Amino acid sequence: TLRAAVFDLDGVLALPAVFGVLGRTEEALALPRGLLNDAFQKGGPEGATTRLMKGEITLSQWIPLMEENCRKCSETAKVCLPKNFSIKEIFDKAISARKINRPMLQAALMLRKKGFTTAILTNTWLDDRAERDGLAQLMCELKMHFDFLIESCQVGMVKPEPQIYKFLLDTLKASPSEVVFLDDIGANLKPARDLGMVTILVQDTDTALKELEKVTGIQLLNTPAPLPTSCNPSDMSHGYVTVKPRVRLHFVELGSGPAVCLCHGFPESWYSWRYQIPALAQAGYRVLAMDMKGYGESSAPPEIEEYCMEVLCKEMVTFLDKLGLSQAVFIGHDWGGMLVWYMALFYPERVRAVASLNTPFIPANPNMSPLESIKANPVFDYQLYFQEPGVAEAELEQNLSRTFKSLFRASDESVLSMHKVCEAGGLFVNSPEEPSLSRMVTEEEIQFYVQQFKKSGFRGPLNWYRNMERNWKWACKSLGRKILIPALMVTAEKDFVLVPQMSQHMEDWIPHLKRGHIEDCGHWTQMDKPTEVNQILIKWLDSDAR
Amino acid sequence: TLRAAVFDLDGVLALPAVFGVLGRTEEALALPRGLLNDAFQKGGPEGATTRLMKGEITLSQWIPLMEENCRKCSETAKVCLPKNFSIKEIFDKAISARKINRPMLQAALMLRKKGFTTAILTNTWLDDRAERDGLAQLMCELKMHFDFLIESCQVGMVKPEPQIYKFLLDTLKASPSEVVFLDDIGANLKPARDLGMVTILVQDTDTALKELEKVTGIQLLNTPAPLPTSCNPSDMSHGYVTVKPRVRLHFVELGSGPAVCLCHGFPESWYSWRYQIPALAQAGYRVLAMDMKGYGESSAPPEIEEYCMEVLCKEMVTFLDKLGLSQAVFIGHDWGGMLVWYMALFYPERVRAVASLNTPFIPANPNMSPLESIKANPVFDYQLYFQEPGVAEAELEQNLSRTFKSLFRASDESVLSMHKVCEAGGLFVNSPEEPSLSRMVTEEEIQFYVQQFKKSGFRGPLNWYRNMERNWKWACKSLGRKILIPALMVTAEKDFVLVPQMSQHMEDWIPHLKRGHIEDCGHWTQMDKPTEVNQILIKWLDSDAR
Numbered sequence A, B: 001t002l003r004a005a006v007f008d009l010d011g012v013l014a015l016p017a018v019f020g021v022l023g024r025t026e027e028a029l030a031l032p033r034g035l036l037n038d039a040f041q042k043g044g045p046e047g048a049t050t051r052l053m054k055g056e057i058t059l060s061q062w063i064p065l066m067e068e069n070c071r072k073c074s075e076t077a078k079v080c081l082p083k084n085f086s087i088k089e090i091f092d093k094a095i096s097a098r099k100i101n102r103p104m105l106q107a108a109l110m111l112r113k114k115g116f117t118t119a120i121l122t123n124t125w126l127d128d129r130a131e132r133d134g135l136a137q138l139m140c141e142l143k144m145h146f147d148f149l150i151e152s153c154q155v156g157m158v159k160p161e162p163q164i165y166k167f168l169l170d171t172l173k174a175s176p177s178e179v180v181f182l183d184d185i186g187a188n189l190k191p192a193r194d195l196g197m198v199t200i201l202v203q204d205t206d207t208a209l210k211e212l213e214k215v216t217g218i219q220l221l222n223t224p225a226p227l228p229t230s231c232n233p234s235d236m237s238h239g240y241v242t243v244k245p246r247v248r249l250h251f252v253e254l255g256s257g258p259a260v261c262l263c264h265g266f267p268e269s270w271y272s273w274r275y276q277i278p279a280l281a282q283a284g285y286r287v288l289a290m291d292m293k294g295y296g297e298s299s300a301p302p303e304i305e306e307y308c309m310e311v312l313c314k315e316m317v318t319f320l321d322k323l324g325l326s327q328a329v330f331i332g333h334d335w336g337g338m339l340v341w342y343m344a345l346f347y348p349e350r351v352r353a354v355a356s357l358n359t360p361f362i363p364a365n366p367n368m369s370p371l372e373s374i375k376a377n378p379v380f381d382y383q384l385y386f387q388e389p390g391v392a393e394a395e396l397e398q399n400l401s402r403t404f405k406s407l408f409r410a411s412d413e414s415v416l417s418m419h420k421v422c423e424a425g426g427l428f429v430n431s432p433e434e435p436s437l438s439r440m441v442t443e444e445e446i447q448f449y450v451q452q453f454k455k456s457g458f459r460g461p462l463n464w465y466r467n468m469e470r471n472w473k474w475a476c477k478s479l480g481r482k483i484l485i486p487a488l489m490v491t492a493e494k495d496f497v498l499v500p501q502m503s504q505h506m507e508d509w510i511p512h513l514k515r516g517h518i519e520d521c522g523h524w525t526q527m528d529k530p531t532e533v534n535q536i537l538i539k540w541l542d543s544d545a546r
C-alpha cells in the first residue's frame, strides 16, 4: 500500500530536460551524433560530471573541465568544433528554457493533499554562475510543495549508486513497498525497482500520469482546476511595527521586488489574502499583508476617533516610514478599498499604484450629511445598527464560529437577509444557530478567524463605521482633486452591498482608471474567485506598477 | 530661552531652491525678467499656486493652470515662449536637482541631540507626477530626523498666513520666545518675527549657521564629523520566521531593494549593525539584520549540535525559503563572517554576494584535528576555556553589564589579557569589577545588550564554539571547491583575534576577491569605525551586488 511519491527534477518536474540539449546542440551544429553527450559522461564515476553531481566542485569549476572533454571527444571522432562554441552559453540557455512541468506538480500536489509524503530526489550541481538566480527561483517555487528535497550535491551521493536510495527511504521513514518513484532515466529507475519500490519511466507526462493514477488509485489526470496555493500561518514571516505609543501594526511578508500592501475589509484579517500572497510573491512582488488596525495581532484601541480615515491613513504612512519604504502599491478590499482610495488622494507620493476590490471611489456630498446619504440606500441599513457602541459587538461576539460561517458565503449561499436589520433586532435574527459550511471555506479556515477575533473582538472593527461625520469632513478637503496615479477598480457581479453600478461615475475623478470585472462573484472576492483576482491583479501590476 | 528650531524645506534644508529655477529658465531662454516667476504667483491667495500649496489640487492638476498663466504673462510682456517649452520638464529637473543641504541637517541634528524640539514647516504640494518617488525618498530621509513635519498641503494653511504659525506653536507646545525659525523667504519670516520668535533669513548656509549658533549658544559650524544615524529598537520593523518546530529567527527590517542579510558575531545582536542599517537602507537596499540563533529574540535551544555550521546554514536557507527570497547578499562579522563564507560554499545559488568583516576564509586542514590547529595559535586559548559546558556561561552571566563593558572596547582601551585564559581561571580574572565606559558605546547601548542576554544567556552563543569537530568534517566536503560568486574581505588593523594577515591566502580559494581595510580598528568593527564600514560596504554593494 502506497503512501509516498518521489519525483526527479530534470525531465519529470521540469521541462525541457537539460540533458536533452546536448543532442539538440549536436543536431543544430551538424556535429557527430553523441559527441556532446559523451563529453558530458566522460570518466564515468571518476569523471568531472560525477564530482560536480556529488558536490566536490561547483558548476563554474566544471565548465572548463567539460570544454576539455569536448576537445578530447572530437580528436577521436576526427572533427572540429565551431569558432565561438561556448559550453556556458549552451547550459545558460538550457537552464533558462527549463520550466516547471505544471501537470506533474498538480499530480504531486493532489497526492500530498490525499495524505502522501512527497519528495524530490535529484542529481544536481552547486550553481555559482552569474545567472544562478533563475534556477534558485525555480527550486524555491517547486520545493515548498514537497515534504523533502534531496539534492545529490548536498548529500554527496548520486543516482544510480544504491546508497542514495537507502538514504531516500530513511528520510521518507517508509519501506520500499509504500513508495512510487518517477524518473526519465531508466538506469536511475533500476535501483529503486530492484529494492521493491513502484517505478514509472517518464517519457511523456500524460502516460506517466496514467501509470501514476493506476498504481495510486487517485484521479490525477483530467482533474478540475485546483485552487491557487494558500498560506499556512505558522510558515509565514510575521512583522510588527509600532506606529505610535499605543499602536502596533502586524503584517505577513512574502517575496521580493516592489512593495505591495494588501488591505482587508470588515470583519476580516491578513488571511483574507491567503490565495493572493504566494501568487503575488511568485509574480515578482514583495507582499505586505496587513492586519488592519483593530484586527488580529494589530493593536485595537477602544476609542472611536482612533478609526477615522485620517488617522488610519496617517498611521499607514508611518508604517511605510518605519519600514523604510518611500512607496508601496496599495491594494484594498471593502473597508481596505476605501482606505486605499484615501491613501491615493491624500498621499499620492507614497502610493506607487492603487487597486480596489468591490469598493468604488465616491466623493463626499458637501450638500448632504453622511447619515442622510446612508438612509437614501436601504441596503446600508445595517450601518445604522453598527452605530450604537456595544450593541453589534454583543451579537457578533456571542458565537464567533456562527458569525464567520454566516458571513463568509458565496452569492448562491445567502443565509443573511440584510434589509430591516435594526427593525428585526439584529444581523442573525432569522439565521441558523449552526450554519452550514460554505464551499468557499474549510472549518479550519473559519477557526483561524475565530482565534484571531478572540483577542480584541468587534469593537475596533466596528469603530471603522463610527466616524462617518469625521470622514465626510476630511473627504470634503479632496473635492477639488483628481486621482491621476495608476488606478484599478475591480467589480464583483454578485456583491449586493458593493454593487458594480456604484462604480459607474469613477472615471470623472480617475480619468486614466483601469478596470477588472468578476462574474458570479459575491462580496468575499478573494476567497470566492481567487484564480481570477490573481489573474487581474498580476496583469495590472506587471503593466502599471513596475 | 530657546528650546525649539523650525526649518523651511526649499532653500533651507534642501538645495538648490526649486523657486530659483524659474529665474534660471528665464536667463537660459532669454525670456523677459520675472516672466516665469510672475506666472507662478498669478492670482495671489486666489491663484492656482495657493490652491496647490493648500492642497485643494494636486501638482498634475496645477501643471496645465501654470502653463495657461505663462501664456497670459507673455501676452502683456509682448513676447512668445519657445517651440517645445514644458513646465513639467522644468519642474521635473528642478525637483530632481534639489538635494539635502547636509550642513543644515547636521545643525538640526546637533540641536535635537542637545534637547531641542525640531520641526520642518513647509509650503508644499500633493505630488502625483510619475517621478514623485524621488521627492518621497527625500522627504523620508529628512523627516525621520525631526520631531514634526508640517506640510501646507496637508494642513490646508500656507505661509505667510498667520494661522499656520499659531498651528506651528500649538504643535510645538512652546511660546514664540522659545522658538528659532529659519527661512529663505523674508515675507514668510515676518509673521514668526512679529509673534516674538527668533528669525534667521537664509541666503548662504554658513552665515545662517553663524546666526543660529550665536542665538542658541551651541557649536554647529566647523563641528566634528558626526556618527552615522543609529537605530532606536522600538522604532524598527521586527520580523519573526519559524525555521523548524522549536526554532524561530528574529530580524530587524529596513528599506527596499536587493535583500542584504546581516550576520553578527559573538557575543552580539542585530543591534551590532545599528550604524549600518539606516545607511544601507538609504543606499537602496532591503536590510534584514538578524538575531543569530541563540541570541536576543531568536530561539536558543540548549543542544550543542543545534549550533554546528551545517544546521545554522540550513536554517538560514529555510529563513530565505519562508520569506520568499530566492537570494540575499550575506554580510557577516566574526562568527557571522564564518557562517557567511559557508553560505557561499554550500549554497552559492542563494547568495547574491558575500562579504566578511574581520573573519578570513581558511579551508579545513584534513591532516590536522581542529583541536591541534587551535592549540598551534596561543591567541585562541580562550576557545579551549569555552569548550566545557556551563563554565564560561557562569562567568559571562555573573554580571552582564561587566561582561559587555569589558568586551566592547576600542584597540587603545584593552582591559582583557587573553593569553593563558584557562590557566588564569577565566576571561575577567585580572579585570575590574566596574569597568569604565568605552568611547565606542553609551551606557544605554550596553543596557540593550544586557536586556537581550537576560532571555537566554550564553549557552546558545557559546555552543557556536562547541562544534569544532562537526564543522571540520563538514568543511572538508568543500575542499575541492572555490568561491566564484562576488566576495568582499574587510580587514581591521588592530583586531588581535582576527588579524589582517590571517586573510593573506584567501585569493587561492576566492580568485576574484575584492578587499577593504580599516586602519586603527579593533575587533568590534561596526561600532569602532561605522563611517568607514558603511563607505566600504555601500561602494562594494553598488559595484558587485546590483
Ligand SMILES: O=C1CC2(CCN(C(=O)N[C@H]3C[C@@H]3c3ccccc3)CC2)Oc2ccccc21
Residues within 6 Å of the ligand: A265, A266, A267, A334, A335, A338, A359, A360, A362, A382, A407, A427, A497, A498, A502, A523
Ligand atoms: O465609506 C465606505 C466604506 C464602505 C466599505 C464596505 N462597507 C461594508 O459595510 N462592508 C460590508 C460587507 C461587510 C458586512 C459585514 C457584515 C455585515 C454587513 C456587512 C460599507 C462601507 O463601502 C462604501 C461604499 C460606497 C461609499 C463609501 C463606502
Ligand SMILES: O=C1CC2(CCN(C(=O)N[C@H]3C[C@@H]3c3ccccc3)CC2)Oc2ccccc21
Residues within 6 Å of the ligand: B265, B266, B267, B334, B335, B338, B359, B360, B362, B382, B407, B427, B497, B498, B502, B523
Ligand atoms: O571558525 C572560525 C570562527 C572564528 C570566529 C571568531 N572567533 C572568536 O572567538 N570571536 C572572538 C572575538 C570574540 C570573543 C569574545 C569574547 C572573548 C573572546 C573572544 C574565533 C573563531 O574565527 C575564525 C578564524 C579563523 C578560522 C576559523 C574561524
